[PDB]
């Protein structure tokens with residue numbers, strides 16, 4: 599029933615890419631009519647989920663700010679469930695949540711290498727989707743914890759499969775994208791191929807689609823391990839390979855995941871989420 603033109607107007611942002619060759623919209627500030635979407639989704643009584651992992655010192659450094667900002671900006675006006683995965687529940691920041699927000703926490707095993715902590719998320723998310731998320735929400739977003747919501751991140755971002763345009767490479771040509779370029783990896787993307795460079799910090803869609811995204815990415819991760827190779831950008835390299843083969847039905851502009859270190863150019867009209875400065879010396883314990 600819902601048609602693209604009903605809520606999406608690409609002409610509002612003529613200076614940026616607003617539609618892909620496969621007809622998927624690239625959501626930029628100004629192109630969406632949230633009022634129409636809020637009414638539409640409210641009538642369907644949807645619930646939106648959000649998974650976030652915090653293992654090690656990532657808990658103390660980013661979890662509270664992430665959750666506090668999500669409570670205030672994520673899908674306001676609709677029921678939301680935050681799924682928090684931590685290795686130590688006693689360090690879980692229990693903040694006060696607002697109307698239509700609720701959550702639950704799970705204790706997970708901390709992988710020894712941070713690279714595996716990041717990649718294992720694909721396996722864990724899939725397990726949870728099958729165990730409960732598929733029965734609890736209509737859409738699910740999976741996000742990095744090292745970022746903070748800055749403004750409304752609403753229903754205009756929902757879709758079957760949603761990808762995030764990475765802030766540094768959104769205007770670059772495919773041959774400049776940092777895809778895994780070794781043919782020995784399952785994440786390999788040959789020069790001459792590729793649509794965009796997607797950021798692994800944010801991705802989502804229906805539970806069914808996210809299950810496939812995570813399952814396929816994890817299969818590639820395990821395959822590489824058997825071939826004694828590890829993708830340059832780990833799960834992100836695999837995520838980009840997946841989206842090349844199974845194109846996203848919706849893409850979010852860099853306004854939805856911005857790096858202020860770049861500054862604030864003309865294209866970034868209203869930032870909905872920003873990167874946290876990196877602090878690897880503290881939050882990571884290897885390589």
Ligand SMILES: O=c1ccn([C@@H]2O[C@H](COP(=O)(O)OP(=O)(O)O)[C@@H](O)[C@H]2O)c(=O)[nH]1
Pocket residue numbers: 650651652653654656712713715716741742743744799876881882
């Ligand atoms: O020791 C670690 C390494 C990773 N992560 C989680 O995995 C995501 C991916 O890692 P990171 O943010 O370090 O990647 P970067 O964006 O800096 O490449 C993080 O946001 C966390 O949610 C974690 O909790 N602990």
Ligand SMILES: [Mn+2]
Pocket residue numbers: 742743744799
């Ligand atoms: Mn991150």
